[PDB]
Structure 1
Amino acid sequence: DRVKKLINSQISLLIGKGLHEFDSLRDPEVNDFRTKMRQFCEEAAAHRQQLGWVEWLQYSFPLQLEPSARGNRALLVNVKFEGSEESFTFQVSTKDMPLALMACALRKKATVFRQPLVEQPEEYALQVNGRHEYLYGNYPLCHFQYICSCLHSGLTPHLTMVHSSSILAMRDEQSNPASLWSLEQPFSIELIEGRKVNADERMKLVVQAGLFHGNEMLCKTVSSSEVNVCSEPVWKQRLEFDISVCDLPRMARLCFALYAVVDCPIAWANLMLFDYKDQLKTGERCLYMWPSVLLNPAGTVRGNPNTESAAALVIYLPEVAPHPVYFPALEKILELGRHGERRITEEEQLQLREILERGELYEHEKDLVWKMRHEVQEHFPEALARLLLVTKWNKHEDVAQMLYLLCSWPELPVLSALELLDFSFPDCYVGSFAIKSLRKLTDDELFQYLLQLVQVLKYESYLDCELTKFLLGRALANRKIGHFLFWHLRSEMHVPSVALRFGLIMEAYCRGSTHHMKVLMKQGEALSKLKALNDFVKVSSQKTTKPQTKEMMHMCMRQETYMEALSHLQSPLDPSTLLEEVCVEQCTFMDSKMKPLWIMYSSEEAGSAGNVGIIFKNGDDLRQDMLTLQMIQLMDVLWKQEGLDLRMTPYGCLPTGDRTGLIEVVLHSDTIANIQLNKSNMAATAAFNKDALLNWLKSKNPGEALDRAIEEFTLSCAGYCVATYVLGIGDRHSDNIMIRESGQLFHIDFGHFLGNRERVPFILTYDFVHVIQQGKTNNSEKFERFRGYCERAYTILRRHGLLFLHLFALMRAAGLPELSCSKDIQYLKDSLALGKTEEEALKHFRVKFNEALRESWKTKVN
């Protein structure tokens, strides 16, 4: 019908690529992915349209619980019924559950409307006012994030009784429309010609090619002869590799590098030896090369789409048989793997136990762990990664006996599985195994590691893969996973190397949720408008005064195309947050280089909670900032699970397009720089500039409120000192540190991390030390209490050291200039002192903390 056509065009504008372009490729791998993933995604949609009303609440509005609650006191709550202005305020216990609260609200309604109610508390859920958030399930009220948030800021929770019939109606409204192993000859290729090559004509062209299984070489690299620099070089050379065709692992990649010599690299191109159908590739192949910025094994195996500019390499994959050759099926693999030999003294078992309880190892150590592989599966299953790295992947017989053990290997913990997703484990069965051990991930853990999982999609060799199906299935089952999966993919559509894979996943997702595609379209339209408004602000700020640019901005925003496009949307930063009425008079732009837009919203239905802001930033790369903020959030989750709340501010930061993204406004907060200006006729005007920040906290927090504000400052200070030390956040100054009116300190503008290469020391600023000490010169009772907070925070993070290392290792796929090699992850190994005992790492940390105090005292002596 006309609808199928309309949806296809809406998908096209949403993903930023015409769907006709996918068909124009005439690519069988692309075509098969589209068919298969459309089928799988529409199955999910059908499953969803029949969920029960509580199950549909778990899809659309997943519970936001406190980290402590995963796996008393008096409380005032305001409850109202859907479509009623009359509300009931009643005292409840933080230990009470939503059903008791609901049954209580029903009894009030029954007395108020003088009628015993047929409705039972079991037929309801409590919505947070003007938000896509709900309180339901068997959990005390204090376990919910919203109730927890209300208790700390003193404020009263405002809840609406929503009946099942209204929830079911939402579900209804949102429905989709109605053999190789005998081939002993050495692997070889033919390097035919080069096309569109650009280099210095004094030099000569060389083609270096190597066979890789992930990062490791399957044999030594081979180099073609030197041929004089020109546009179309003609080699005609049969390059031979020291590896039998029978020994090529399934995931073997042929990597090429084209360079000029008198060392000047021109381009690179990679390709999988076996196709997506496991057939050994033969024939002629034109490799549209990528411009180099050594060989590039981790780089994409798909050719450069820019066929006009790109230099091309013509190669010939020889026909090794008169019939097609496929990689042997698992049944053939396991049949060969079933046969081997298992058997050395207790002293040699202790040698194996010492190495497996540790990490690089010698060649004699490799020989021991390989022969003892059966004992590895039997007594140390979590050491699979060590055994997988000692497996000789260039020996088809060794690969077979490894796979035999892996196929009966027990499911490993989530920490172990995340390590197996790294590019240093390129086997498909290994990747299928890791995905299997990751199905046990809770939606909360999945959401926490979604950014890393999206990045390891760039390591994939084929379109249809276990990770894609896993991410699609989880996104289709949880709307928040879906929302964030879509944005992570959409923000990378300008990267030609991922635009095809990422575009195809988003299309598949869209087939899974027509309604959500429309909701995301509403977000893309606002972001389109924001870009146009920001471009304008940029040029105006360069010509006239700030009040003049601000007034022109407001007039442009007051156009109906802008009022419609910027209003009534779900926030890309948090689909729970609804951005209702754009507050034009409160909108402005900041004075920094990119003139970022400061956009405010209000919602009568949400009250004070509806007053939310977004920062539109265009011109900067926000990926590193988002990663740093997600890591600080992880620390906060890890500190909270051990009962330590350091009052952190991990505000939203989401890239949405090319050098484009949104940042969450933290209201009632100013930078340390703005507070320290010490302006005249203010409630905080100081006698000593050292008093300015404490005077400001006093003006915001009168009487008893001050002690709480200083404690919030101390807690947040300790968390950020540890966060910035562990992560190597340098270039810290008064204009990238902010303070909230509650006393909470937080950092912004995370341009540089991991010491990028200098060792970032522990930092203690005197201005903050002065606040922690309550404005007293000596207050060791409060100072040492802060030092205990730092040590406790540091100690907790170390216990989770391997979780940070694994996540940051997966993030290497993002290609962030500050996260691109082994030395970057070494910085975290050093900061977290993982090569030490807790006692030794605590002395190490104390020696670093005492050194920061002596630094801070250069300002105390002044």
Structure 2
Amino acid sequence: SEESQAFQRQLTALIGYDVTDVSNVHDDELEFTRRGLVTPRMAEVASRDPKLYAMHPWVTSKPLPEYLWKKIANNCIFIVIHRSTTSQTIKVSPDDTPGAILQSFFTKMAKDFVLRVCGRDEYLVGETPIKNFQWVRHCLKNGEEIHVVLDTPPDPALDEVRKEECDRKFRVKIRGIDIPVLLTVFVEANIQHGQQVLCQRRTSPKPFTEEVLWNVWLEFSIKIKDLPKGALLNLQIYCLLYYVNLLLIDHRFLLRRGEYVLHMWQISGFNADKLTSATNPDKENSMSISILLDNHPIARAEMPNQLRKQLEAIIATDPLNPLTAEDKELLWHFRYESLKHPKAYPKLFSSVKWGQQEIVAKTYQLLARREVWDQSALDVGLTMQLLDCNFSDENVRAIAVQKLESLEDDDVLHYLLQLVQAVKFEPYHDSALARFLLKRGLRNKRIGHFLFWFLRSEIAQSRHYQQRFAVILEAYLRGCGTAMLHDFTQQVQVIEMLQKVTLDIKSLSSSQVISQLKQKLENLQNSQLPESFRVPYDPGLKAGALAIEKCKVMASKKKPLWLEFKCADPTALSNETIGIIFKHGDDLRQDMLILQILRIMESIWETESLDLCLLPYGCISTGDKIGMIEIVKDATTIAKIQQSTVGNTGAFKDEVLNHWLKEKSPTEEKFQAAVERFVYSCAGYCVATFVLGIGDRHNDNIMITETGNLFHIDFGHILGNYRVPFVLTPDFLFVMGTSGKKTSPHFQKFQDICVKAYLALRHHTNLLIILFSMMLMTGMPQLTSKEDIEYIRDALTVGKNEEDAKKYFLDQIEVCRDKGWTVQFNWFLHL
């Protein structure tokens, strides 16, 4: 159809990639995947509750934290209900449902409707106690009043979805290599499964010219019979300069046949990019390799005491502890005992000889008896280990996804970014993981909003994964509904225009620069910029017109744009603007990953009734070295506080921060609350930052709210171009009533909090190791090694008892006290 063609054009603009373009493909896998994803999409669409989908309530099944219960008076929660120019306060029980609150309202005021958060598209609806709404917990945590408006539920009609419409050994011939413009060169051909090399062959070395020919059959030791599903033929050019991969068994279970001309990826003169089955779209300047294939469908005891102790010891070790040949042999030999231990699963499946058909068969038999795994309690860390680069088997990965099905929405949000990144480790485009993400996104608008942005971030800048991610995004967009499609259209339009202004102002650069920014912004406000758009990092908020007067260029070497918008919602309780920073020059995909780990650390701390007052601000990567950042209100740089007496001259003073805090507090009650908040937030960042190895920062990259909340910024800056374990300078110590080498009640509180927080993190060692490992593999190329990944295991002091771990961290605090201002001074000189 022609309007079908118009609909596809609309999707193409939202995706930032054309899924119907068949020029960078040597098979129909992506087209097969598009068709394959129709069923799961349609099944999820057919399953959803129109009213609940439209209202997307944001809820949790987790207990109300101890620190939140203490904020509730006499089992009473106050809710202010608005109707027009007047409002009405109502007392409520924490166990009260919004339905019961609504009937409580009509009763109190007598002599079809829905509760919506004032100024936000957030609804307090469904069969859930109010204490279980995320917004209520947000308000309870931050000392804010819960303000609601009584309004009409959104019409589910707005979410309408458009009507859909061999015993021979394996061998490969290396014909030659070609590159248009330019040593000795050879080609290495590996058969890989789960990052491990099953077999390797190489060509003879030849002079490196624009065309190099071999016409050689490379015969492997592996029989065609033994090639596992998901095995890659990895082809590399050494002088490592270039690489490319080819799936040996295709998406239809057929062995690859015939002629291939593969455009290779160049190494920037391990990482997830090195695993891609995509070929380089640049046919003009890339190196190509020409190959030929020619060769089909797919083919009780009792452990003794000591051996059991040995096996149990292997299972107890961390995910990074290497398995010896003996360890693997024990795991495999006593696999029926290993199966009784869910924690053994990653080690056991690493003991599988994936290049032996009979062994893979024995593994499939083993997993048919999955009673222990199925009955076991969901362990996200354990599940995530089975979805990394180490596992290429469909069945193994699928049992990990099976376990994820039990996660509630709030938990899917906590792990969404890293589950999207895990799609990079999947051998085929259509996978259980990709289907899982599609379903959870279509089931919940909040998950779907973030899935859009996370996918779009990779489609905009990854040539390695854009094709796979674009087919997943199209599948989601074909089921989200028209209201969501309209919303995304507006967001994309705004961000594309603001990205233009960001780069334009970047080319220039003063009073001249600010004048030019304001002229470019009026021009946008004139005939391009739509009336409003949902804030990508906070979709409950809608931004309206630019407040031109408040817009400026930041005084940094990356001269980012500081933009302010009016809120588009009339029901908002304040005339406070929405502040957004637009920056070019840093890879914000790295900031996204750090900020998500910080949120995970906060959830861990919550499990142990600890609130460390972190501030993981909104951040979204929109394209190559470009994106948006949430401006935290009433915040200033530690360096700026130092600068405002004395300079500009590295002359750091101890009392300045405490002075600033006192100046910003309207009363002494508020000042004491600010000092308490500083102690907790300083503790939170010292612990978090140390564990992630990002602790040693210049003061210019640490901020504080007038309310005493410390927080680190600019994570991509350090991770892009990567002594003291963390920042605990004499100014921070003075706020805590400490100087030099003495102690105080606040500093003792700080040390106690640090230890508790550090020990709480250590209870989730394996989860933090997997998350850290995946972050480096998918987000920070050039920070791989195994040595880099091992940092977190040293920081988390694995193999130490709690008392030794406590001493270790207290010693780290002392290192900071010994160094004083020395490190900050060297950061200042390194100008």
Q: TM-score, normalised by structure 2?
A: 0.90
Contact 2:656 2:731 in 1 (8 A): no
User: 2:725 & 2:555 partners in 1: Cα distance?
Assistant: 31
Q: Secondary structure at the match of 1:102?
A: helix
Amino acid at match of 2:672: D
Residue 827 of structure 2 aligns with which residue? none
User: 2:109 & 2:270 partners in 1: Cα distance?
Assistant: 72
Contact 1:37 1:508 in 2 (8 A): yes
Q: Report the Cα offset of residue 292 of structure 1.
A: 2.5
1:289 is matched with which residue: 247, 261, 264? 264
Q: After superposition, where does 1:167-316 map in structure 2 within 5 Å?
A: 167=154, 169=155, 171-178=156-163, 183-196=166-179, 199=182, 203-219=183-199, 221-260=200-239, 265-293=240-268, 298-316=274-292
Q: Report the Cα offset of residue 272 of structure 1.
A: 1.3
- RMSD over equivalenced CA pairs, Å: 3.0
Residue 699 of structure 2 aligns with which residue? 734
Q: After superposition, where does 1:400-411 map in structure 2 within 5 Å?
A: 400-409=361-370, 410-411=373-374
Q: Report the Cα offset of residue 36 of structure 1.
A: 2.4
Q: Report the Cα offset of residue 525 of structure 1.
A: 0.7
User: 1:608 & 1:819 partners in 2: Cα distance?
Assistant: 44
Q: Report the Cα offset of residue 723 of structure 1.
A: 1.3
Q: Report the Cα offset of residue 190 of structure 1.
A: 1.4
Residue 330 of structure 2 aligns with which residue? 368
Amino acid at match of 1:392: K
User: 1:733 & 1:715 partners in 2: Cα distance?
Assistant: 21
Residue 5 of structure 1 aligns with which residue? 5
Q: Report the Cα offset of residue 549 of structure 1.
A: 3.0
Residue 505 of structure 1 aligns with which residue? 472
Q: Secondary structure at the match of 2:389?
A: coil
Q: What whole-Å deviation, never above 9, does each CA across 1:283-329 have from its counterpart, x for those lacking one?
A: 1222221112399994212222212222221112123xxxxx1123x
Q: Report the Cα offset of residue 631 of structure 1.
A: 1.3
Q: 1:151 to 1:496 in 2, by over 3 A?
A: closer
Q: Secondary structure at the match of 2:818?
A: helix
Q: Secondary structure at the match of 1:773?
A: coil
Residue 332 of structure 1 aligns with which residue? none
Give yes or no for the alignment of 1:63 onto 2:30: no
Q: Secondary structure at the match of 1:257?
A: strand
2:593 is matched with which residue: 613, 621, 627? 627
Q: 1:825 to 1:464 in 2, by over 3 A?
A: same
Amino acid at match of 2:522: R
Q: What whole-Å deviation, never above 9, does each CA across 1:435-478 have from its counterpart, x for those lacking one?
A: 11211122122111111111121222222221111111111111
Q: 1:190 to 1:791 in 2, by over 3 A?
A: same
Q: What whole-Å deviation, never above 9, does each CA across 1:683-732 have from its counterpart, x for those lacking one?
A: xxxx9943322222122212221111110111111101111111111441
User: 1:294 & 1:567 partners in 2: Cα distance?
Assistant: 46
Q: After superposition, where does 1:782-797 map in structure 2 within 5 Å?
A: 782-797=746-761
Give yes or no for the alignment of 1:693 onto 2:672: no
Residue 333 of structure 1 aligns with which residue? none
Runs of 5+ in structure 2 lacking a partner?
Answer: 67-71, 825-831
Q: Secondary structure at the match of 2:80?
A: strand
Q: Secondary structure at the match of 1:387?
A: helix
User: 2:6 & 2:257 partners in 1: Cα distance?
Assistant: 41
Contact 1:529 1:562 in 2 (8 A): no
| Matched positions, count | 797
Q: Report the Cα offset of residue 342 of structure 1.
A: 5.1
Give yes or no for the alignment of 1:15 onto 2:15: yes
Q: Secondary structure at the match of 1:595?
A: coil
Amino acid at match of 1:53: K
Give yes or no for the alignment of 1:347 onto 2:345: no
Q: 1:2 to 1:295 in 2, by over 3 A?
A: closer
Q: 1:250 to 1:20 in 2, by over 3 A?
A: closer
Q: 1:627 to 1:45 in 2, by over 3 A?
A: same
Contact 2:271 2:781 in 1 (8 A): no
User: 1:632 & 1:754 partners in 2: Cα distance?
Assistant: 15
Q: 1:661 to 1:755 in 2, by over 3 A?
A: closer
Q: 1:805 to 1:636 in 2, by over 3 A?
A: same
Contact 1:725 1:763 in 2 (8 A): no
Q: Report the Cα offset of residue 800 of structure 1.
A: 1.1
Q: Report the Cα offset of residue 91 of structure 1.
A: 4.6
Contact 1:472 1:509 in 2 (8 A): yes
Runs of 5+ in structure 1 lacking a partner?
Answer: 112-122, 320-324, 329-340, 681-686
Q: Which moved more, 1:647-656 or 1:304-313?
A: 304-313
Residue 326 of structure 1 aligns with which residue? 297
Contact 2:115 2:124 in 1 (8 A): yes
Amino acid at match of 1:665: I
Q: Report the Cα offset of residue 197 of structure 1.
A: 6.2
Q: 1:631 to 1:418 in 2, by over 3 A?
A: same
Amino acid at match of 2:680: L
Amino acid at match of 1:235: W
Q: 1:388 to 1:342 in 2, by over 3 A?
A: farther
Contact 1:273 1:281 in 2 (8 A): yes
Q: 1:536 to 1:404 in 2, by over 3 A?
A: same
Q: Which moved more, 1:31-40 or 1:707-716?
A: 31-40
Contact 1:194 1:312 in 2 (8 A): yes
Contact 1:629 1:651 in 2 (8 A): yes
Contact 1:678 1:689 in 2 (8 A): no
Q: After superposition, where does 1:532-551 map in structure 2 within 5 Å?
A: 532-540=500-508, 542=509, 545-546=510-511, 548-551=512-515
Q: 1:563 to 1:150 in 2, by over 3 A?
A: farther
Residue 516 of structure 1 aligns with which residue? 484
User: 1:226 & 1:154 partners in 2: Cα distance?
Assistant: 70
Contact 2:242 2:264 in 1 (8 A): yes
Q: Report the Cα offset of residue 763 of structure 1.
A: 3.5
Q: 1:7 to 1:774 in 2, by over 3 A?
A: farther
Q: Report the Cα offset of residue 487 of structure 1.
A: 1.1
User: 2:424 & 2:180 partners in 1: Cα distance?
Assistant: 27
Q: What whole-Å deviation, never above 9, does each CA across 1:614-665 have from its counterpart, x for those lacking one?
A: 1111232111111111111211121122111111111011101121111101
Contact 2:657 2:735 in 1 (8 A): yes
1:644 is matched with which residue: 606, 610, 614? 610
Q: 1:317 to 1:27 in 2, by over 3 A?
A: closer
Q: Report the Cα offset of residue 346 of structure 1.
A: 2.7
Q: After superposition, where does 1:24-39 map in structure 2 within 5 Å?
A: 27-39=27-39
Q: 1:206 to 1:802 in 2, by over 3 A?
A: same
Q: 1:294 to 1:394 in 2, by over 3 A?
A: farther
User: 1:619 & 1:273 partners in 2: Cα distance?
Assistant: 39
Contact 2:58 2:133 in 1 (8 A): no
Give yes or no for the alignment of 1:40 onto 2:16: no
2:619 is matched with which residue: 630, 653, 660? 653
Q: What whole-Å deviation, never above 9, does each CA across 1:234-270 have from its counterpart, x for those lacking one?
A: 211111212222121122211111233xxxx432121
User: 1:407 & 1:425 partners in 2: Cα distance?
Assistant: 18
Residue 79 of structure 1 aligns with which residue? 81
Q: 1:240 to 1:23 in 2, by over 3 A?
A: closer
Q: Secondary structure at the match of 2:284?
A: coil
Contact 2:506 2:558 in 1 (8 A): yes
User: 2:624 & 2:526 partners in 1: Cα distance?
Assistant: 22
Q: 1:86 to 1:23 in 2, by over 3 A?
A: farther
Larger RCO, structure (CA 8 Å, separation 6 or more): 2
Q: Report the Cα offset of residue 809 of structure 1.
A: 2.3
User: 1:155 & 1:434 partners in 2: Cα distance?
Assistant: 40
User: 1:744 & 1:609 partners in 2: Cα distance?
Assistant: 23
Q: TM-score, normalised by structure 1?
A: 0.87
Residue 331 of structure 1 aligns with which residue? none
Amino acid at match of 1:175: E
User: 1:664 & 1:433 partners in 2: Cα distance?
Assistant: 38
2:493 is matched with which residue: 507, 525, 531? 525
Q: Secondary structure at the match of 2:506?
A: helix
